Structure 1
């Protein structure tokens, strides 16, 4: 079987969708999402709010998993990992393994997983329904390397795959978005959107 997780959108029985904040485009804004590109632009280690929307509430014990894969076919097989420089940096929260690219901040029940067959990394939190009167549940992700990091992503674009799963790991829903971790998310979003409109 393939060692590359599927990226196919699957809203599933609960109508699972992702939402992103309306952020702006100042040159070095910490995080900003492009709907035209379905692509998040963000700085290293900064908060990236991701909204979980459902049409109906999934059962208790539902989990939310985030995992990165390289976007290009030529690189899908390679596990996405932190580069050796940032791996050795003293910046662990005491829970996230230093090799993991994606973290979750502000959650008491975070789990960091290494797949036993594919060796891919992922980070898991329990699914929580929105507060009564709220439309969605917001998770704060962090990406611990720039897309450009030498010896790590090395300028290769990645996708983040968000899955809703039961406690057994069965797929309840799946969505994805592209990520660029860079120094100037506002400049780069504008550049990439202009290259899109030009072509």
Structure 2
């Protein structure tokens, strides 16, 4: 099977938002609207905003999952490479095999799907004075990792779910985990032009 990647705002007007971090060679995470693609360094904080037009019910959750972007690879489970899955960089909560972690949320749950074997991380659902909520993700392998992503592009799919896991909303973005996100974004954006 292959998870749907179709954008779906749903009843609550769910969609993502990204900061404007620029493309300085020092930057650790940067998002390209033109490419709908996030470029980030290994294991660095990736702030992703969650926007809604109205507040979803108590018990609503937000799940993240990675899939390969190319159709010929889409049935393969995205996982950490043979090196990184064994490097004992556990935060005590994320399984060592999971590519995507949520940073600084003790209520994060990590799922190994019993049927598809795919990995995901899910958190429960702004503060006073704020207009959106932000989740902080980490990507724990480089796009280039041999025996893992192996230079294949991935997408992250973010789904808004009810307490049963039923779909309420969906958005997605491509991700490249690389040493120099600023330069790579600049390069790919120029290539697109």
CA contact (8 A) 1:44 1:183 kept: yes
Cα deviation digits, residues 125-169 of structure 1 (max 9, x gap): 00xxx0122111000000000000000000000000000001101
Measured after TM superposition, the shift of residue 188 of structure 1 is 0.3
CA contact (8 A) 1:65 1:123 kept: yes
Secondary structure of the structure 2 residue equivalent to 1:187: helix
Using the size of structure 1 for normalisation, the TM-score is 0.95
Secondary structure of the structure 2 residue equivalent to 1:84: coil
d(CA) in 1 for partners of 2:66, 2:81 = 14
d(CA) in 1 for partners of 2:132, 2:77 = 31
d(CA) in 1 for partners of 2:191, 2:31 = 16
Question: Is residue 61 of structure 2 the alignment partner of residue 63 of structure 1?
Answer: yes
Measured after TM superposition, the shift of residue 108 of structure 1 is 1.4
Measured after TM superposition, the shift of residue 28 of structure 1 is 3.8
Runs (5+) with no aligned partner, structure 1: none
Measured after TM superposition, the shift of residue 183 of structure 1 is 0.2
Using the size of structure 2 for normalisation, the TM-score is 0.98
Question: Is residue 171 of structure 2 the alignment partner of residue 175 of structure 1?
Answer: yes
d(CA) in 2 for partners of 1:47, 1:181 = 12
Measured after TM superposition, the shift of residue 27 of structure 1 is 1.5
The residue that corresponds to 2:48 in the other structure is 50
CA contact (8 A) 1:81 1:100 kept: yes
The residue that corresponds to 2:162 in the other structure is 166
d(CA) in 2 for partners of 1:43, 1:136 = 24
d(CA) in 1 for partners of 2:173, 2:132 = 18
Give the number of equivalent residue pairs: 192
Q: Identify the match of residue 187 of structure 1 among 161, 183, 189.
A: 183
CA contact (8 A) 1:67 1:121 kept: yes
d(CA) in 2 for partners of 1:132, 1:16 = 19
Alignment RMSD: 0.6
Structure 1 residue runs of 4 or more that deviate by more than 2 Å after TM superposition: none
CA contact (8 A) 1:28 1:183 kept: no
d(CA) in 2 for partners of 1:60, 1:99 = 30
